């Protein structure tokens, strides 16, 4: 199933090299994972902790930090930046 990232999210995804306007959820999660990893936003010691308070990701998610363990929260934050395609 396809999703359409809203503009700030799409800009983030494009900043890692993605070129599409329409993605599967798995693609969105893949590119967002690469973004977090390459910008080194994760905690060195507990690498499920992500710090986004001085990053585009923080504006997008509306939080200063989160843990990868917070699955529902991550999806909630993602889905606010996407439209599901009919």
């Amino acid at each position: 199933t396809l999703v359409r990232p809203k503009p700030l999210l799409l800009k983030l995804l494009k900043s890692v090299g993605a070129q599409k306007d329409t993605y599967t959820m798995k693609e969105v999660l893949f590119y967002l994972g690469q973004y977090i990893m390459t910008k080194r936003l994760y905690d060195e010691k507990q690498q499920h902790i992500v710090y986004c308070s001085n990053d585009l990701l923080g504006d997008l998610f509306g939080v200063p930090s989160f843990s990868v363990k917070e699955h529902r929260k991550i999806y909630t934050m993602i889905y606010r930046n996407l439209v599901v395609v009919n």
Binding site: K26, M37, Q47, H48
Partner: peptide
């Protein structure tokens, strides 16, 4: 686990 391994866990369940 590294961040990419945590990432990969989440992604795989999508």
């Amino acid at each position: 686990l590294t961040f990419x391994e945590y990432x990969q866990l989440x992604l795989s369940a999508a």
